[PDB]
From Swiss-Prot:
The gene is aflC. Changing residue 120 to N: Abolishes hydrolytic activity. The active site is at residue 93. Residues 23-258 are annotated as: Thioesterase/Claisen cyclase (TE/CLC) domain. The chain holds residues 1845 to 2109 of 2109 of the full protein. Norsolorinic acid synthase; part of the gene cluster that mediates the biosynthesis of aflatoxins, a group of polyketide-derived furanocoumarins, and part of the most toxic and carcinogenic compounds among the known mycotoxins. The four major aflatoxins produced by A.parasiticus are aflatoxin B1 (AFB1), aflatoxin B2 (AFB2), aflatoxin G1 (AFG1) and aflatoxin G2 (AFG2). It comes from the Eukaryota. This is Norsolorinic acid synthase. The domain architecture includes starter unit:ACP transacylase (SAT), beta-ketoacyl synthase (KS), malonyl-CoA:ACP transacylase (MAT), product template (PT), acyl-carrier domain (ACP), and thioesterase/Claisen cyclase (TE/CLC) domains. The SAT domain receives a C6-fatty acid starter unit and transfers it onto the ACP for chain elongation. The KS accepts the hexanoyl-ACP unit and subsequent malonate extender units are loaded onto the ACP from the MAT domain for chain extension to generate the linear poly-beta-keto ACP-bound intermediate. Disruption phenotype: Impairs the production of norsolorinic acid, as well as of the four major forms of aflatoxin: AFB1, AFB2, AFG1 and AFG2.
Length: 265
C-alpha cells in the first residue's frame, strides 16, 4: 500500500506566477505556514513567490506520513501551479532542507532545478530535538512573530499546535538518508547564514550532540552544501548581527531578498 500524505495547499505571497519570468517556491519552515515568507521585501527581479503550507500545521499530532510521502505532496502542489520546469526552490530552516529534498525528487523525475535558496539551514539530516523550553524561550522574546497564530511581541503563549509542529517536522525527517543531486546541470545556490545564536551557549539547553542553532557558526562557506551539489555556484551571505529567527525580521530580511534577486537575476 502506498505511503500516504494529505495534499498540500499554497498561496502567492508576491508577484504574478506564469506571467513573471520565474516563480520561487518556498517550502514551509518548522511552523508549517507559507506566511513565514510574507516578511520578504518585494523582489526587484521579475520573480513571483509562492509558499506552501504544511497540511498538518494545526494538528501535528496527526502527521503520520513518511518524509517521502510529504515530499511527494509538496511536489504535487508545485507542479499543479507550474506543470513544467525549470523550477526554483527555497526555504528557511526545515524548509531549506525540504527544498533540497524536493529538488531531489524533481531531478529524479527528469526535471531541471535552476535555483536553490537556503535560509540558515545545514544540509538535510536527521536532527536532535530542541526541548520545548528552548522554543518557549524564543517565544518570550517574540521570535515567533513570523508564525501567523503566534504573538508578535511574545506577550502571550503560542498557539497550542505551534511548538509541537516544530517537533513533528524534526521527527518526520528522522528516517532521511542523504544523497547528492543527480542532475548534470547544478542549480545556482544562495545561502544565508546567521552569525549569532538566540541564547548564549553557556545558557543553552544540554544536548547529546552539536546543533546549528546552539553553537555560534565559524564556518561561512558552503559548509556541506557543496558536498551534495558539487560543481554549483554558491552566493553566500553572512548575516552579522542576526540569529536564526531575527534573520527574518524587518531588521535583516532585506539581505535575503537581495540574494534572491542576484541568484535569479
Amino acid at each position: 500500500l502506498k505511503p500516504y500524505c494529505r495534499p498540500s495547499t499554497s498561496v502567492v505571497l508576491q508577484g504574478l506566477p506564469m506571467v513573471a519570468r520565474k516563480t520561487l517556491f518556498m517550502l514551509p519552515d518548522g511552523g508549517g505556514s507559507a506566511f513565514s515568507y510574507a516578511s520578504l521585501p518585494r523582489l526587484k527581479s521579475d520573480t513571483a513567490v509562492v509558499g506552501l503550507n504544511c497540511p498538518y500545521a494545526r494538528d501535528p499530532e496527526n502527521m503520520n506520513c513518511t518524509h517521502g510521502a510529504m515530499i511527494e505532496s509538496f511536489c504535487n502542489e508545485i507542479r499543479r501551479r507550474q506543470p513544467r520546469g525549470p523550477y526554483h526552490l527555497g526555504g528557511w530552516s526545515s524548509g531549506g532542507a525540504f527544498a533540497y529534498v524536493v529538488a531531489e525528487a524533481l531531478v529524479n523525475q527528469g526535471e531541471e532545478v535552476h535555483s536553490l535558496i537556503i535560509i540558515d539551514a545545514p544540509i538535510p539530516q536527521a536532527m536532535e530535538q530542541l526541548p520545548r523550553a528552548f522554543y518557549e524561550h524564543c517565544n518570550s522574546i517574540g521570535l515567533f512573530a513570523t508564525q501567523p497564530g503566534a504573538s508578535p511581541d511574545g506577550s502571550t503563549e503560542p498557539p497550542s499546535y505551534l511548538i509541537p509542529h516544530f517537533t513533528a517536522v524534526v521527527d518526520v525527517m528522522l528516517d532521511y538518508k542523504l544523497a547528492p543531486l543527480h542532475a548534470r546541470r547544478m542549480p545556482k545556490v544562495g545561502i544565508v547564514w546567521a552569525a549569532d545564536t538566540v541564547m548564549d551557549e553557556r545558557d543553552a539547553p544540554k544536548m547529546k550532540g552539536m546543533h546549528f542553532m546552539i553553537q555560534k557558526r565559524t564556518e561561512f562557506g558552503p559548509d556541506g552544501w557543496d558536498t551534495i551539489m558539487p560543481g554549483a555556484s554558491f552566493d553566500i551571505v553572512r548575516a552579522d548581527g542576526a540569529n536564526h529567527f531575527t534573520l527574518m525580521q524587518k531588521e535583516h530580511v532585506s539581505i535575503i531578498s537581495d540574494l534572491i534577486d542576484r541568484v535569479m537575476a
